[PDB]
Each structure stands twice: as structure tokens, then as C-alpha cells.
Design a protein that fits this description.
Length: 442
RNA sequence: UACGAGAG
């Protein structure tokens, strides 16, 4: 009955994602040896070469393409604490689409960092995808990160302490820069080919006394990688964050008054709160909250409640408004926001000034594509062109949007229910993306 | 699961 966890394996090409994942699957005992050899021989027949530990993640990537799904029972294995399933990994056509749309959602990210001579340098170079992948993971809101320092068996001396520390520190400063505190990240020197250190201390690694992570939830320490997968925590509702409540409708009930209606996305709504409506900037008091024809002392995330407010007319507040706590991170109007989008099937080309309608939470406002900033490869997330001339179907890009009318939006990392939007033109959804940063208006 | 950018 162990709770389930979704894993995405990110990292630079040839850094050892597939090998590490496949060897982990082998050691975890999720697949019997006979079936393992059968699938190894199948892979050898399909492609020329040796696919030992490589057929697992490569097969997963190949089965996440062109909407063909036969079986996913192979990539489900059991740790001591959880049942963990490999979902997706970079290196296929639909990776970015699955990441942005959420069809492939992951609770924790396993960054495999190649660590031998020349590898750790290349992975973080201009052409390296390590930085791209970590930035994408942070953008998507995957705040739990595992760093596998892989193929370490290749230094001189064979397992260098200072090479490990070099990678660790130069990674740690950079992700302190982007937003992961290095203390919560477990670092483990491994070689996916050797199966080094995966489930028990490696005899080749006497100096690696163990890994230690310092988290707000408490410190944890270990040696092997299985324990790293055992450090993960379950998914949960945001019932401690500030209040956020998109307005779906506002009604005028005879003998009661104005009664906005919507679903609580984060935080708590209770009677007596002083609430602020954005972007209209209207502050009032909640007279009462009703759900299931009963008076509710508090409204939890997910509760679609209707609450009565005083001194506010129905013409004052409307659909698309975001309601929040007036004295705890209150909602505010968005002057502009920067988002990363992937262009779906579009009748033509997208240029600067393109102004489609944006559907964010319950809002429906036309936003102008002010600037076409960057063009991103949809296959690996690698930056291809800066300031592209135009965008077509299949192009991933980062653009700046200016709402044509007052709009209230949030970033995907902080308030996921209000950070993802859909771009629709005519009857077609031409693009879907997530918001990175928002410039709150005065 | 159909439907949906997602919640559902």
C-alpha cells in the first residue's frame, strides 16, 4: 500500500541516464532475470549494439512517442519506502510537450552528472544540457532533486575525492544561484556500468563515508542510491499557503447579497477574513461561507464554496478575479509576464505582435506576444536561436506577453493552479505553456 | 477512461 512516486531522469546526452536507470531497475528486482535477458535480446535485434541497462530508459522514451502505449509495467519497481515509476526522460520528440502539458508529471528529478575526465566539463558547457535540464526542472516546480555523480570510475586516482568535491561545489554554487539549496540534494559517486555504490557501500570507495542532506524536515544521511530514492516525500495539497480563489461566478441571491463562487486552490478561506479581489483591488469582509448547505468554519483547498461578502456589488467583482488574503501575500495585477511555451498545430507562422486569447485559471484575456525572445529545441530543451524571426508548429520558445486588459496571474513554481495557461486561436489550441516570472503592477 | 492546457 506504499504511496506512489513519479521520477524523471534528466541529464546531458551520454551522461549515463539510460545506463544508470536500467541498472537500478535490474538491481531493484522489478523484473525477473529471464524477462530481462529476453528484452535485452529484443533490443539487440532491434538495434545494432549492446543495450545492457540501456534498453529500459530507451524503450520508455520510444514508447512515449506518437501516442503509442502498450505497457508500462516494466518501469514500476519497489524501494524500501515507496513504489517508484519511471515516467519520462529527455531525448524524444514529445518530451517538452509532455513536460509542459503535465501528461508526464514527476515528483522528483534524478540528475545524472557524468564525472570522468572531460564529462563534467562538457555537461555544463554552452552545448551542455545539464544547465538547461536543471533550469527546466526548477521551472516545472520539481523542487526535490537527486544528483547522481556517475561514471566516476575513470579518474586518476581511480575515485578522486577532490574531483567529487570539485563537481559538488561548482554544482552547489550554481544551483544556489538558480534556486535549489545544495544541502537538500544528495550527492553519490557512482558508475552506472559498474553498479557502484547503488545498494551497498562500494569497495572501491573507502573515502566516501556517506552522503548527508540537511532539510527543513530534518537531516538524513546514507551511502547508497536506494536510500536516496528513500529520501523522497509524498505529494500533498497546499493547505498551508496563502489563500488563492479564482472567481468562476458571482451571483445576487435575494435576501443574502453578492455571493462569489469558485474553488479554493491554495490556503484557507474562513468567515470574518478581510479578503482582497484582484486585479480590481477591492477589499471587503466575508460575511459567511457555505458548502453542502452547511456553514463552514474553514474552506480547504479543493472545496468549491460560495461565500457572501458585504458592501460589494455584483458589478464590482466578476469572473476571472483572484481572491486572496488581504494580509498574507495578497494578489496583485500583472503588468507583464515571461513564459515558456510550445507551439502546437498552427495554421501559419507566429510573429511579434501576435495577440491570441489566453486561458489562465478562470481568466479569458487577449495577450500580445510582445517579444519572441528565444527558440527552444522541443527534443532536449536546448537553446537553438535567440530572438527568432518567427515561430511555427513544433517550436518551443520563451516569449514575453503583455495583457491587453488587467489580468491576475502567478508563476507556475509558486502557485501552479495559476501559472499554466492555454493559447487558443479560432477553435484550435495553438500553444500551451507555463509562466516563469511575473511583473506585478503598482 | 471518454472530455479537458490542467484541476476534475
Amino acid at each position: 500500500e506504499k504511496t506512489h512516486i513519479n521520477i524523471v531522469v534528466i541529464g546531458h546526452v551520454d551522461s549515463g541516464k539510460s545506463t544508470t536507470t536500467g541498472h537500478l531497475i535490474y538491481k531493484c528486482g522489478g523484473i525477473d532475470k529471464r524477462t530481462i535477458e529476453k528484452f535485452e535480446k529484443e533490443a539487440a535485434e532491434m538495434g545494432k549494439g549492446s543495450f545492457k541497462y540501456a534498453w529500459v530508459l530507451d524503450k520508455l522514451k520510444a514508447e512515449r512517442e506518437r501516442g503509442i502505449t502498450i505497457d508500462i509495467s516494466l518501469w514500476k519497481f519497489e524501494t524500501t519506502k515507496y513504489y517508484i515509476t519511471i515516467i519520462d526522460a529527455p531525448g524524444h520528440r514529445d518530451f517538452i510537450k509532455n513536460m509542459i502539458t503535465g501528461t508526464s508529471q514527476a515528483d522528483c528529478a534524478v540528475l545524472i552528472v557524468a564525472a570522468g575526465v572531460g564529462e563534467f566539463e562538457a555537461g555544463i558547457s554552452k552545448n551542455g544540457q545539464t544547465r538547461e535540464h536543471a533550469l527546466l526542472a526548477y521551472t516545472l516546480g520539481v523542487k526535490q532533486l537527486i544528483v547522481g555523480v556517475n561514471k566516476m570510475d575513470s579518474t586518476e586516482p581511480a575515485y578522486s575525492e577532490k574531483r567529487y568535491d570539485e563537481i559538488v561545489k561548482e554544482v552547489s554554487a550554481y544551483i544556489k544561484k538558480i534556486g535549489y539549496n545544495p544541502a537538500t540534494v544528495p550527492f553519490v559517486p557512482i558508475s552506472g556500468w559498474h553498479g557502484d555504490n547503488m545498494l551497498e557501500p562500494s569497495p572501491n570507495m573507502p573515502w566516501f563515508k556517506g552522503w548527508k542532506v540537511e532539510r527543513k524536515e530534518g537531516n538524513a544521511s546514507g551511502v547508497s542510491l536506494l536510500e536516496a530514492l528513500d529520501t523522497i516525500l509524498p505529494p500533498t495539497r497546499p493547505t498551508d499557503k496563502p489563500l488563492r480563489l479564482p472567481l468562476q461566478d458571482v451571483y445576487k441571491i435575494g435576501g443574502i447579497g453578492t455571493v462569489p463562487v469558485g474553488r479554493v486552490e491554495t490556503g484557507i478561506l474562513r468567515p470574518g477574513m478581510v479578503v482582497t479581489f484582484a486585479p480590481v483591488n477591492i477589499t471587503t469582509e466575508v460575511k459567511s461561507v457555505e458548502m453542502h448547505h452547511e456553514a463552514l468554519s474553514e474552506a480547504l483547498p479543493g472545496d468549491n464554496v460560495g461565500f457572501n461578502v458585504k458592501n460589494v456589488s455584483v458589478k464590482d467583482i466578476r469572473r476571472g478575479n483572484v481572491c486572496g488574503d488581504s494580509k498574507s501575500d495578497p494578489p496583485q495585477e500583472a503588468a507583464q509576464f515571461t513564459s515558456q511555451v510550445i507551439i502546437l498545430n498552427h495554421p501559419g507562422q507566429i510573429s511579434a505582435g501576435y495577440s491570441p486569447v489566453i486561458d489562465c485559471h478562470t481568466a479569458h484575456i487577449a495577450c500580445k506576444f510582445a517579444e519572441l525572445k528565444e527558440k527552444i529545441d522541443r527534443r532536449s530543451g536546448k537553446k537553438l536561436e535567440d530572438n527568432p524571426k518567427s515561430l511555427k508548429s513544433g517550436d518551443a520558445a520563451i516569449v514575453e506577453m503583455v495583457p491587453g486588459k488587467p489580468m491576475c496571474v502567478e508563476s507556475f513554481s509558486q502557485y501552479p493552479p495559476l501559472g499554466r495557461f492555454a493559447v487558443r486561436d479560432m477553435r484550435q489550441t495553438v500553444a500551451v505553456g507555463v509562466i516563469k516570472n511575473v511583473e506585478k503592477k503598482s
